[PDB]
């Protein structure tokens, strides 16, 4: 049946709240909806072998839950401090009857990126969906406040980590495989307070489009997803200022931010074998901002 | 299982072939694949009520087949000369166990656009997916060859028809409904020989994004699909020069054009109730050109 | 010397004000600055032969003044009710020592478009800069309020008029000539209240890019300019709602709208013979919105 | 007078030619035209104080020549091996009657970036035009060939160097100053063989747009220039495969690549004080490809 999207999920104002990054979904108010109850699989990805970075919380968690419910085995990356979020996702993947692999570690470390891919492929018996979804986002009002360490941390997480993981993954990927990279509306919106983050998110789009041309001839599709505002720990752990969290997305056409559950369908559609002429695309889901 | 997209469908060279517009799918060599055998529904749109313009052939036919197999009732628009293509789609909708409504007529006629919507809604018992997919595309190498009649025919079909149909449809659309407009990579690629067509396809994107902001607050989502090259009668009936048809998409990353079957998943995903934060988006499927 | 752009021109709030379209610059509060005092020519367009539609006021007036001061002869189009604005521009072109031609008439009339070009070329002794700058902009909050007459008036002014004038002009344009089309940030921003206008402005970009590919081989360059908010009669005569006029561009990085004087340099640079590899471009001047 | 842009400059085929990067303009066949004879200044930047990275050759050299001829003092960065190109630019700046400052060194070195800005500002008596134009571009057909050292060299040159130089420069820039960043059509075209380069060029655009929003309120404008193909040593020293150099831009609307002379007007126009509402823009000059 039909459902009105406007009031399907919570609207601001939200309680004043902050966490140290990367944060925990379980400490947000309200708790985000990653599709734990609502997502019903229909056999769209049976037997696929998936690695999702940042699969413990937020958009990556929603994708991991959906992939498992569609019949795919799922390895998740995350940072060690997020173990309490990650254990929930691992249990949900397993409750869908599929294999879950927990692979915590810092993707700014090149050797860890190599081990992440090797261990995921070994555990799953192969690899044929890669989702580069982990990110650092730390807002700063001025470039004068941005140290080299700040800029480097954002670029190493969001560009180098993706590069190393993707490079390590390609020798495993058979014809028919899919790579999906999470970008952001910030690639275009380029807010004053997200100078380094926006740089990396625009970079991710060109990386996606170039790699799609490179790998298309080998039968591997490479695509990106461009979210607008979603209710995740990235925002309340310093990705946005606190007043922005309280009134998050209040001025958007629905008057509310997205919940991660709502974007999982884009990841399933892009990975599915039937979506065979989608390559090099950036698919947006921004609730009416109309960016991608 | 995994399937290599590169050789899943035919590659050029194709036989020298030309038709008068709008053409018939059954006269193309090879016959296009709209998903007649391959598309399997999974209950994703049960009971939805759909109107697809240009649903007799090509991308619109692939969308109509998929919608019916996902459980939706489907009305199709087309031009009277296309009856032999259209009756096949009516039969496919009925073979999926759903109601089919055949509504031929010329969408450059404002009164016909009003009757099309009124008759579709009356026959289906409502309306909650509208796909503005019909188009005119007639390549010309120079503006000196483009008469006012040429320009007006393209603009009246691709902009005015969409405007009139959409305006008439909105009073029928409940919260939870979806409007999907087919645009083109030509909105950006803007080839020398498609001056009027490219103008209209860029126009369709801004129309989509503006209307998404108007209707989002009312719970209606408005999105666009941007195909790259697909094997359809629009291309061999004057949309492309004949030598381009012979070698169509030969230089693309897969070395082949898309078949309409491959893009149907985008229409299903955009219409599904679960894709509830996709509004004002343009989703491409261009086989690695990397436009949208 | 250096000048701070932030406070170079007036900032809101502006007096409550409205006019019947197309409006008069002389009735705005404050009066707009089209460069009447500030623009100093430097011989950049000596002997060029120009036609500017909407050259009586706003951006077109600023371009006409600059072209004349750079040594070009200038014909201007405008609507008859704007005679009092137009006579000022004609006097300023002539005070720069160049020829001015006043060509009032409605560009929605195909025969007038043909006469406009023929009379401009006859009077000037040729034609080698064409600026399609006239536009209709009438905001409406809902498609339900938008009659066919409303939509048609916007599309006929902004797309058909450009088509007819451009088609009539090309046989006059020698190698080295330039066509410049004014678009808008609305092509991308696509506000809810500018459904028809935004459609046409996106269309203008694809028209520009396609015609550039068509005419590049003949040595004719075709480019577009994408303004952000400028203080012109288009806004207070129904292009924007009244509260928007009072607080116009207050939230932008400078906190003020542009004055037409500020965008004239883009038109001069695009027309100049030295800018010989700019073809098919869209150059923005939006005061930090960062759209084009 | 009018000049036909099509045959104003050389067209392919060009001789088979390759150099080690960064290469020398003097070894290209034919020698590039940076405007040494053609560019005539008109007092548009009198007394400005400029730093151009990569000012020894190519687009940066054309900008440096034009800036000096418009009345600005010019410091140039370059790599020590390019001294024979750089000394010619120093001589051209001095022949225009302005001060030239030669500042060779490697912008991947953060301490050098700080010294570069400090020494330029000290020598010139201030700083008010900064052009981040240096780049690394090394084509590779596959990500398997791209070592971390390759990726890091491109990212450190094109993103970190820009970040460090810009951060060091801002405390010197008074209201009225301009920052201009050279990007590329590759930000959008994203070719298969330019995976790291295209990533950085898209990043540069978002960096530009974000910084424009930060600095606009302080009266500093930040813009980008997006060249299409130009005849420069970056291309024949590994930026393109050798067979592409031989046939460079043969299929474009003019059938020839740009010469650096042709793009200098964009840098002058963006820096000029009169262009006061251009902020956060990307202005293309791609010869009819129609990208930006
Ligand atoms: N939430 C939004 O509004 C929004 C908007 C646009 C784009 N995005 C994108 O969505 C993606 C997912 O973020 P999210 O919003 O779901 O938030 P999230 O905090 O739930 O997910 C980000 C994840 O990144 C991972 N991560 C961060 N640094 C890492 C490191 N050094 N090593 C390993 N893993 C690391 C963490 O595991 C974390 O869970 C990101 O790419 C982000 O850019 C989010
Ligand atoms: N095939 C491609 O390469 C391609 C590429 C990009 C975009 N598109 C878009 O795909 C959409 C569908 O076209 P297609 O390629 O499937 O070709 P198609 O010929 O199968 O479909 C176009 C349909 O338009 C309908 N139509 C045309 N003029 C009409 C009129 N006056 N009144 C009513 N109906 C009318 C016809 O019924 C026709 O079947 C179009 O919007 C087109 O712009 C196609
Ligand atoms: N002012 C802004 O904020 C803004 C922003 C983006 C784009 N633009 C564009 O700038 C261009 C110029 O408008 P402006 O803002 O300088 O306002 P303006 O009112 O000064 O100029 C518009 C002109 O259009 C002409 N015109 C309108 N309908 C016509 C018709 N039927 N026949 C002949 N001429 C007709 C009138 O002569 C009028 O002076 C337009 O193309 C507009 O889309 C303006
Ligand atoms: N030529 C083209 O076709 C083309 C196309 C699009 C964009 N671009 C852009 O144009 C800009 C200028 O390049 P060009 O084509 O004029 O070629 P070029 O080789 O003449 O200039 C590039 C310059 O970069 C400098 N450079 C490189 N690495 C450096 C380092 N580590 N430290 C200091 N300086 C360093 C060198 O001094 C060199 O002269 C670049 O940003 C490039 O991305 C060029
Ligand atoms: Mg987390
Ligand atoms: Mg048909
Ligand atoms: Mg006027
Ligand atoms: Mg050099």
UniProtKB/TrEMBL annotation, chains A, B, C, D:
Binding site for NAD(+): 57, 59, 82, 106-107, 133, 135, 197, 201, 230, 232, 234, 248
Ranges where the record places region Disordered: 1-47
Basic and acidic residues biased stretches: 30-39
A GO MF label: oxidoreductase activity, acting on CH-OH group of donors
Domain of life: Bacteria
A family per Pfam: adh_short_C2
Annotated Mg(2+) binding sites: 56-57, 82
Matches recorded under InterPro entries: NAD(P)-bd_dom_sf, Sc_DH/Rdtase_CS, SDR_fam, TAT_signal
Keyword RNA-binding appears in the UniProt entry: no
Keywords recorded for this protein, A-Z: Metal-binding, Nucleotide-binding, Oxidoreductase, Signal
Record-stated family: Belongs to the short-chain dehydrogenases/reductases (SDR) family.
Protein name per the record: Uncharacterized oxidoreductase YghA
